[PDB]
């Protein structure tokens with residue numbers, strides 16, 4: 001169709017902006033995860049002894065570990081915000097609608113990019129200098145022990161789709177421009193940008209994955225999977241905040257979490 | 262006082 005060339009231009013623009021916004025790309029995470037790097041190997045946290053061992057690079061241990069994730073999530077919100085501002089039309093949206101889209105979208109993007117840092121054995125932590133084993137995460141007291149298992153299963157399935165950074169840039173842009181987020185004031189312009197991003201994604205996958213049958217449909221289904229993951233994420237902070245009252249929360253996270261209560 | 266707004270406007 002007449003828009004196909006412009007859809008490749010938009011695809012390239014989002015890929016360039018993604019490289020600009022996200023230091024730790026899938027390509028870098030896979031290189032680290034397969035020792036195809038001249039970086040130093042990452043430290044491996046697999047037990048209580050090895051976590052203390054690696055203390056220098058991060059109450060009750062399970063809480064300290066999950067509280068520790070706040071620094072990475074604050075950096076990720078900043079990166080995602082920079083990326084969102086590069087999406088054509090985004091900065092012209094109602095500023096309150098831009099806040100809403102970031103508030104309801106960031107965790108879905110964090111779990112998406114986390115899949116890039118995961119294999120069936122464990123997850124890259126501390127900007128890629130640490131590897132924390134699935135097994136070690138499985139061993140934390142309930143409910144923490146059960147929490148990451150379904151995240152690892154999502155990742156293995158997501159990673160089996162063999163998406164690259166070019167694919168992911170457009171996928172993430174589609175998720176940001178979700179017109180069904182609670183409290184959006186003007187949904188039409190958001191769905192108009194999303195519709196064009198979906199056309200750009202559909203064409204990206206057809207050209208970049210020509211033998212990957214229904215890859216577009218499978219990717220839309222992953223966006224559904226990511227919303228369930230975020231519901232479970234929020235349900236855990238909710239459960240622990242019933243017993244642990246004095247818990248620290250970075251102001252920026254306080255804003256993202258407000259009203260999900 | 263929105264921290265997301267401050268990030269959005271920078």
Ligand SMILES: C/C(=C1/c2ccc(Cc3c(C4CC4)nc4c(Cl)cccn34)cc2COc2cc(F)ccc21)c1noc(=O)[nH]1
Pocket residue numbers: 063065066067068069070073110111114123124125132148233234236237240241249253
């Ligand atoms: C405040 C908080 C979490 C927090 C921190 C991490 C996680 C799950 C998680 C992630 C997600 C991609 C953010 N990534 C990891 C890793 Cl790499 C290891 C262990 C757990 N992880 C979930 C949660 C939600 O539940 C909590 C429960 C607590 F008792 C204490 C803290 C938390 C948080 N940190 O970053 C967030 O986005 N939320």
